[PDB]
Structures are given as structure tokens and as C-alpha cells.
Design an enzyme around this catalytic site. Sequence first.
Site, PDB file in Angstrom:
ATOM      1  N   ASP A 157       0.841  -1.198   0.000  1.00 49.70           N
ATOM      2  CA  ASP A 157       0.000   0.000   0.000  1.00 49.70           C
ATOM      3  C   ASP A 157       0.876   1.249   0.000  1.00 49.70           C
ATOM      4  OD1 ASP A 157      -2.238   1.586  -0.100  1.00 49.70           O
ATOM      5  OD2 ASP A 157      -2.967   1.100   1.906  1.00 49.70           O
ATOM      6  N   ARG A 161      -0.119   9.060   0.917  1.00 51.39           N
ATOM      7  CA  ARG A 161      -0.878   9.062   2.165  1.00 51.39           C
ATOM      8  C   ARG A 161      -0.243   8.173   3.227  1.00 51.39           C
ATOM      9  NH1 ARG A 161      -3.717   6.333  -1.641  1.00 51.39           N
ATOM     10  NH2 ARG A 161      -3.595   4.068  -1.348  1.00 51.39           N
ATOM     11  N   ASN A 162       0.574   7.197   2.825  1.00 53.15           N
ATOM     12  CA  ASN A 162       1.248   6.309   3.761  1.00 53.15           C
ATOM     13  C   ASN A 162       2.725   6.647   3.922  1.00 53.15           C
ATOM     14  OD1 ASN A 162      -1.022   4.825   4.498  1.00 53.15           O
ATOM     15  ND2 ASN A 162      -0.747   3.323   2.849  1.00 53.15           N
ATOM     16  N   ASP A 175       2.190   2.277   8.170  1.00 52.77           N
ATOM     17  CA  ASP A 175       1.071   1.367   7.938  1.00 52.77           C
ATOM     18  C   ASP A 175       1.517   0.071   7.274  1.00 52.77           C
ATOM     19  OD1 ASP A 175      -1.382   0.166   7.654  1.00 52.77           O
ATOM     20  OD2 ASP A 175      -2.355   1.876   6.676  1.00 52.77           O
TER      21      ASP A 175
HETATM   22  C1  LIG Z   1      -8.930  -0.808   6.830  1.00 46.04           C
HETATM   23  O1  LIG Z   1      -8.014   0.237   7.154  1.00 46.04           O
HETATM   24  C2  LIG Z   1      -7.859   0.416   8.536  1.00 46.04           C
HETATM   25  O2  LIG Z   1      -8.668   0.017   9.260  1.00 46.04           O
HETATM   26  N1  LIG Z   1      -6.640   1.106   9.046  1.00 46.04           N
HETATM   27  C3  LIG Z   1      -6.576   1.792  10.338  1.00 46.04           C
HETATM   28  C4  LIG Z   1      -7.842   2.566  10.668  1.00 46.04           C
HETATM   29  C5  LIG Z   1      -6.265   0.807  11.430  1.00 46.04           C
HETATM   30  C6  LIG Z   1      -6.191   1.238  12.721  1.00 46.04           C
HETATM   31  C7  LIG Z   1      -5.908   0.340  13.729  1.00 46.04           C
HETATM   32  C8  LIG Z   1      -5.689  -1.015  13.424  1.00 46.04           C
HETATM   33  F1  LIG Z   1      -5.403  -1.901  14.436  1.00 46.04           F
HETATM   34  C9  LIG Z   1      -5.760  -1.451  12.124  1.00 46.04           C
HETATM   35  C10 LIG Z   1      -6.042  -0.557  11.120  1.00 46.04           C
HETATM   36  C11 LIG Z   1      -5.417   2.815  10.264  1.00 46.04           C
HETATM   37  C12 LIG Z   1      -5.683   4.156  10.426  1.00 46.04           C
HETATM   38  N2  LIG Z   1      -4.643   5.020  10.352  1.00 46.04           N
HETATM   39  C13 LIG Z   1      -3.424   4.576  10.129  1.00 46.04           C
HETATM   40  N3  LIG Z   1      -2.341   5.566  10.078  1.00 46.04           N
HETATM   41  C14 LIG Z   1      -0.960   4.962  10.578  1.00 46.04           C
HETATM   42  C15 LIG Z   1       0.256   6.026  10.551  1.00 46.04           C
HETATM   43  N4  LIG Z   1      -0.107   7.316  11.123  1.00 46.04           N
HETATM   44  C16 LIG Z   1       0.856   8.017  12.006  1.00 46.04           C
HETATM   45  N5  LIG Z   1       1.810   7.293  12.567  1.00 46.04           N
HETATM   46  C17 LIG Z   1       2.749   7.888  13.372  1.00 46.04           C
HETATM   47  N6  LIG Z   1       2.693   9.232  13.583  1.00 46.04           N
HETATM   48  N7  LIG Z   1       1.714   9.975  12.994  1.00 46.04           N
HETATM   49  C18 LIG Z   1       1.495  11.348  13.088  1.00 46.04           C
HETATM   50  C19 LIG Z   1       0.408  11.652  12.330  1.00 46.04           C
HETATM   51  C20 LIG Z   1      -0.194  13.089  12.142  1.00 46.04           C
HETATM   52  C21 LIG Z   1      -1.408  13.419  11.533  1.00 46.04           C
HETATM   53  N8  LIG Z   1      -1.525  14.747  11.584  1.00 46.04           N
HETATM   54  N9  LIG Z   1      -0.393  15.239  12.208  1.00 46.04           N
HETATM   55  C22 LIG Z   1      -0.130  16.632  12.457  1.00 46.04           C
HETATM   56  C23 LIG Z   1       0.408  14.262  12.539  1.00 46.04           C
HETATM   57  C24 LIG Z   1      -0.043  10.476  11.772  1.00 46.04           C
HETATM   58  C25 LIG Z   1       0.813   9.428  12.216  1.00 46.04           C
HETATM   59  C26 LIG Z   1      -1.534   7.906  10.713  1.00 46.04           C
HETATM   60  C27 LIG Z   1      -2.708   6.815  10.741  1.00 46.04           C
HETATM   61  N10 LIG Z   1      -3.123   3.282   9.971  1.00 46.04           N
HETATM   62  C28 LIG Z   1      -4.094   2.370  10.029  1.00 46.04           C
END
Ligand SMILES: COC(=O)N[C@@](C)(c1ccc(F)cc1)c1cnc(N2CCN(c3ncnn4cc(-c5cnn(C)c5)cc34)CC2)nc1
Length: 294
Positions: A157, A161-162, A175
Site C-alpha cells: 500500500d 498518504r502512507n 502502515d
Molecule cells: C482498513 O483500514 C484500517 O482500518 N486502518 C486503520 C484505521 C487501522 C487502525 C488500527 C488497526 F489496528 C488497524 C487498522 C489505520 C488508520 N490510520 C493509520 N495511520 C498509521 C500512521 N499514522 C501516524 N503514525 C505515526 N505518527 N503519525 C502522526 C500523524 C499526524 C497526523 N496529523 N499530524 C499533524 C500528525 C499520523 C501518524 C496515521 C494513521 N493506519 C491504520
Amino acid sequence: NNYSYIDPTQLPYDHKWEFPRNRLSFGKTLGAGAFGKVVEATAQGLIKSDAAMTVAVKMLKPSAHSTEREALMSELKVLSYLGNHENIVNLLGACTHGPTLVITEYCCYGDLLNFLRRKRDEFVPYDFLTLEHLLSFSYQVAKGMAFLASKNCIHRDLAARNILLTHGNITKICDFGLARDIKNDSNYVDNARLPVKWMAPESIFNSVYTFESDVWSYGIFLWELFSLGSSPYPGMPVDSKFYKMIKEGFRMSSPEYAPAEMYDIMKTCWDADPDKRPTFKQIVQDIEKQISES
Ligand SMILES: COC(=O)N[C@@](C)(c1ccc(F)cc1)c1cnc(N2CCN(c3ncnn4cc(-c5cnn(C)c5)cc34)CC2)nc1
């Protein structure tokens, strides 16, 4: 069968990662979806005993099936096996003794796609976003992916966005929920919602994922990067016509700010023949030379 490939998801969870649940204070939600959410948090005593630090905490909804719990643990084991690298969002700890919590680095600038859209208006080719930044980002992501490929892992993926941005203009791949160690079979055969516009044709048509399909997605990421965060295939919906055009060889043209050598990489990443696509190791050396000549 005296020699085998060590499956990182078969290895035991290393309790060196374990961190007390009560030492996390949850803050604003950073991402949400069907499986659960990622939340910002302060972790007291995680690195230094007396200091609190900001982390990201990934967690499942209570309703998640035990198969979703296994998948989060498999992601944890993949990150543990990969080890530290500057260009990946690194694992910091886990809470496995209520719900499973995976603690990673917090990237203060968020995802690269929104970052590019913020800075698009003030972008200049030569605190403004510049072409030098875009070259660095392309280089850092290729380094991270080269590292993943050297560990026989595919991300599946890869997209702007990732990619997260943190202090020092450092980009980190995040992710790893769909990442796979494919050491044994040289590819991976996957009904969830899929990022169609980032997928290689063999992944769409035959559900095959390889090192080479990760390279296709990297090409799409480059197009995102040098178009300053535009959606790929603009004005083309995912429908029958989209699949037909991709199969027949239609490709995006060079974005406005992409150097010719970078669009050259994009085109090779998008070859219909997976064998003709470059490796991430080759991409790193290419971008190295481009950077070395300003
Ligand atoms: C079908 O799909 C799913 O269900 N997936 C999700 C929902 C899922 C959740 C739990 C789970 F158990 C399984 C899946 C999911 C949702 N989100 C994410 N990502 C991972 C990396 N992220 C960040 N990581 C470290 N720092 N950080 C700082 C910022 C930031 C943003 N704004 N500012 C100013 C700073 C963002 C990050 C963002 C979110 N990954 C997976």
C-alpha cells in the site's frame, strides 16, 4: 526440509517491546477506519524513565474478530523482524497483557499527501517547499523500500498518504498492516477495499503482489509527489474504462514539476512487463546521481 526461510510471523512476540498500558495517555485521533484507530498519545517513561514522549498508538475496535487481532500481532512481528531504519515508522513498544496496542514513532508533520497540498500554493521550483525537497523525499522513500525489499518484504500500500514527515524533513513509510514476507514463494496472492489507482495491473487482474508491484506503486507515488499532491489519473473514475486503458498501456504524463530523469523512472516503474521494472536498489542509485548534480 533441513533448511527453510524463517517466517517472521511465526516467531514468538519478544517481550522486550512490552510497555505498561497505564503509562499511556491518549490524545487526538490520527486515523480511523473499519478495524480501529491510530491515536496520538503521551508515553511516560518509554525511552527515559522520568520523561514523557509523544507516540502513535494503533489499536483495534473491541468488536474485531480474533483474525483481526492476529493480523495486528503479525504486523507487530514484521516490524520487530525488520528492525530500525531511518525511513520507516519505527516500532517503540506494545501492550499485549486489555486490547492489543502497538506503539510507534510520532511523525509531527503528518502524511505527505496533505503536507504537499498545504504547501502547493507557496511551492517554488528554486520555509517554502522546493524541488530540492521533492528530490530528497523520492530518495528517502526509495531507501526505505530498498530496505524492505532486502528483508524479503513487500508493503502493498505504498502511496503518499502512507508516507509520514517528521523533524528534519525525514520521510518514514508507515502502515504495515498489509505487508508480507514473501521470501518463500517470490510473490504473494491475496476481498477488502483496494487502492486500485496505485496497483500494478497484475495485482488488479490476478491478485498477485511482488517486489515489482511495490515498484509500480512507487512510480505512482512519484507522480503524486511532483504534481504536489494531486490525485492520480485525474478525472478518470475507477470503472470498466479505467481497467481497459491501463491494460492497453495508458499511462499518466509527466507532472509539471517532475524532472525528466524522474519521469523516466516513473515510466519504467509502470512497465506492463514486471521484469522490465527497476529495483528499488537501482532507483536509489539513479536518484543519488541526480542529487549529486544539484
Ligand atoms: C482498513 O483500514 C484500517 O482500518 N486502518 C486503520 C484505521 C487501522 C487502525 C488500527 C488497526 F489496528 C488497524 C487498522 C489505520 C488508520 N490510520 C493509520 N495511520 C498509521 C500512521 N499514522 C501516524 N503514525 C505515526 N505518527 N503519525 C502522526 C500523524 C499526524 C497526523 N496529523 N499530524 C499533524 C500528525 C499520523 C501518524 C496515521 C494513521 N493506519 C491504520
